[PDB]
Amino acid sequence: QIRQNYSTEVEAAVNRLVNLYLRASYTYLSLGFYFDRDDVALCGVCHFFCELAEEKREGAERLLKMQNQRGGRALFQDLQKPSQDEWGTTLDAMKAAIVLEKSLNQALLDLHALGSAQADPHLCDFLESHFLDEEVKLIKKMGDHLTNIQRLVGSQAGLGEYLFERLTL
Amino acid sequence: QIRQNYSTEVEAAVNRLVNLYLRASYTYLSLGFYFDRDDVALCGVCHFFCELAEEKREGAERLLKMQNQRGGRALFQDLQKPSQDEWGTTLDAMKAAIVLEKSLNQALLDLHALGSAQADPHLCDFLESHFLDEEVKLIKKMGDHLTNIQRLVGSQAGLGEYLFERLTL
Amino acid sequence: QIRQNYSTEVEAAVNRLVNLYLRASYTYLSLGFYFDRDDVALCGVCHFFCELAEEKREGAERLLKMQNQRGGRALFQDLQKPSQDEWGTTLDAMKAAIVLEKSLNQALLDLHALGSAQADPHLCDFLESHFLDEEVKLIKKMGDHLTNIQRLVGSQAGLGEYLFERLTL
Amino acid sequence: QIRQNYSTEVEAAVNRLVNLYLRASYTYLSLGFYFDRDDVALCGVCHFFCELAEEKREGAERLLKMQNQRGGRALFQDLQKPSQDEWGTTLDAMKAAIVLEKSLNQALLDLHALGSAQADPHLCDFLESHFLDEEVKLIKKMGDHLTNIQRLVGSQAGLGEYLFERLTL
Amino acid sequence: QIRQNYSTEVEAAVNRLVNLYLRASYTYLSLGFYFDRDDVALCGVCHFFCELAEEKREGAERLLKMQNQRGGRALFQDLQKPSQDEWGTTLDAMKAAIVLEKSLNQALLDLHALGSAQADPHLCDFLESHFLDEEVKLIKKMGDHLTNIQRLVGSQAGLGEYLFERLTL
Ligand SMILES: [Au+]
Ligand SMILES: [Au+]
Ligand SMILES: [Au+]
Ligand SMILES: [Au+]
Ligand SMILES: [Au+]
Ligand SMILES: [Au+]
Ligand SMILES: [Au+]
Ligand SMILES: [Au+]
Ligand SMILES: [Au+]
Ligand SMILES: [Au+]
Ligand SMILES: [Au+]
Ligand SMILES: [Au+]
Ligand SMILES: [Au+]
Ligand SMILES: [Au+]
Ligand SMILES: [Au+]
Ligand SMILES: [Au+]
Ligand SMILES: [Au+]
Ligand SMILES: [Au+]
Ligand SMILES: [Au+]
Ligand SMILES: [Au+]
Ligand SMILES: [Au+]
Ligand SMILES: [Au+]
Ligand SMILES: [Au+]
Ligand SMILES: [Au+]
Ligand SMILES: [Au+]
Ligand SMILES: [Au+]
Question: Which GO terms describe its molecular function (chains A, B, C, D, E)?
């Protein structure tokens, strides 16, 4: 047995956080393929979301690795289908992405508060090291994108959506 | 004599498909030079169509080579002049290109159905190997372009046509 | 408008000359594939004619480019099928090729005489620069080949046709 | 057990096709050594057939590998001695080689028809991928050679046989 | 004395053509600096015209060199100030540039007609070699630019002028 200072409550919340990262990965998978449709065709938006799918997957994998390192047991649940089949405009999609990110970020903060109350400094360090700053950086970037997308709608939405995709993404 | 399992019906349809690829080549030749006119001047649209002329020619040449490999006899017909002397906007041109591509693709599918009914698996493989996936890929790309061109017309068609040509093509 | 010192008569004759180069290209296409037949199988003769197809195409493309540069309008006609479906011996084929070349060359000379009468020195230079010397060089080469092919028929035509293809082409 | 969608009929026909490729290999072995005899001495003809021996062997080996991959059982029979001890002229030999190739090719086509009736698309793909086009290419090449050999017999058969071997093979 | 077959009429017209190239150079000098004004600030338009100033100067220098080579005497006149102190929009400027180019081109054609009537084939070659095709190419390019500038005015002239300068020039 290696397990030491690792509460059952932290273990369960780690498994839930894995499910949340894998669900986010799947959402981004769906977002990316929507933007590859012939009737949507925004290559840069596609690559943005498919890159996010991969980051969220890797996030999950790091959590699973840590779960094993601490002597927890990984437990997998169903992955819920993404919340939409079609994602609207780049604007709608980027709003939905930031809502999702803020939910992951809140889950990280809740897990951290749990870690602190359980006096589990390895867990707190792990989150700080690999998750909290990355999520803050990602959210700031999405925020910046959203501001630029919004700036570009004005009178000519098609034009703005095209330019954004060509010159930013 | 090398000829084996090669029906006269397949042979004739191969010669027709050659004529269709060469005609497509000629259409793209005309499309490219229209976009090089001083009063049209869309360099990127020109290069897109002149690249297509060359692919369609090479398509024809591969069919002719296969015709000879199987012991068929190449038979050439007149090449019909393209359907238009002037091709309108990039939008009109890209619509016309996708109509042409869907007609080639239908001809490939009809030749394949013939091959299958004649039990000619070399022909079916040949089409699969070098034509069916290429045409599907090309059509998807045209579809994507058309979506972006359309997105860009909105209120300011000149502006959109220029941007598309500079930033996509 | 860019057009200057460019007569409608020159413009039409340029379009006709394009048709003649594309027709020549198509003839050479047919000549090349005839020599790739399993029952003809003269690899070097094939490569000679397929190289000519490509030169004639490029000739056409240079004419079209010049048509646009001068502010003329390219107009495409049907391309007539080559004059033969089967081309006989290398000798017959090379005779037919030199007849075709002399017809292109006469058309270049007629266009030049037109240019001179219209006082269009850009056109005269263009023809001199890229067409007249090339055609003269090509015809001399064909002439040389024909002399060597003829020398080789004598009593043993098969033998001579094989040697020519292996040691010259 | 790995075996899935793999009929006993396909399995048996695969073993027969292996025997046919190994027999062809052996025939080419005999053809090559006949042309290395001091009283035949046609080095290029020898290398042509010994290269074919090796291709036919490799063909057999790919079939055996696939047999194992699908969970079939390889079963070996006697290899029949080649049909001739002495192979005559390069012409006779090349005719005999094309007869042999057309028999392999018919066996491939029969196995493919079997695959299609058994709804075994892995087998159909395997044949298409590695056998059908290769055999078609090889037969076309033999056909070309035969045409050139025949062209060369005329009045002076020794001369023609020597030239062919030096300048083509 | 080297002078041979070089008429006094050609000599004078060569000196006039030098004055016309130097005047064009000076016009382009003025055009370039207008577009470098802080209240105009179109860097790409500036570089386009300053590059033209240099080409026109070099044109003059080649004419002077040829004048000396033939044993003519260079005679210099006043260079007339450009026709405008301020050049308006990129559109106005490009129209004015094409008017100027068509005037040079007409002068080249008139000098050529003179050369032909004086039976001075060195002069005709010189013009053909270094001036007639270059001017035709330059005019076609200006024509293309003008078409794209015009396409871009539509409703939002400032926007179009900026994009043209950033993405074409
Ligand atoms: Au994607
Ligand atoms: Au993508
Ligand atoms: Au802590
Ligand atoms: Au901490
Ligand atoms: Au903490
Ligand atoms: Au083009
Ligand atoms: Au082009
Ligand atoms: Au099939
Ligand atoms: Au198939
Ligand atoms: Au099929
Ligand atoms: Au060829
Ligand atoms: Au060839
Ligand atoms: Au002339
Ligand atoms: Au001339
Ligand atoms: Au002339
Ligand atoms: Au051998
Ligand atoms: Au050998
Ligand atoms: Au099939
Ligand atoms: Au199949
Ligand atoms: Au298949
Ligand atoms: Au099949
Ligand atoms: Au400047
Ligand atoms: Au500048
Ligand atoms: Au002259
Ligand atoms: Au001349
Ligand atoms: Au002249």
Answer: ferric iron binding; ferrous iron binding; iron ion binding
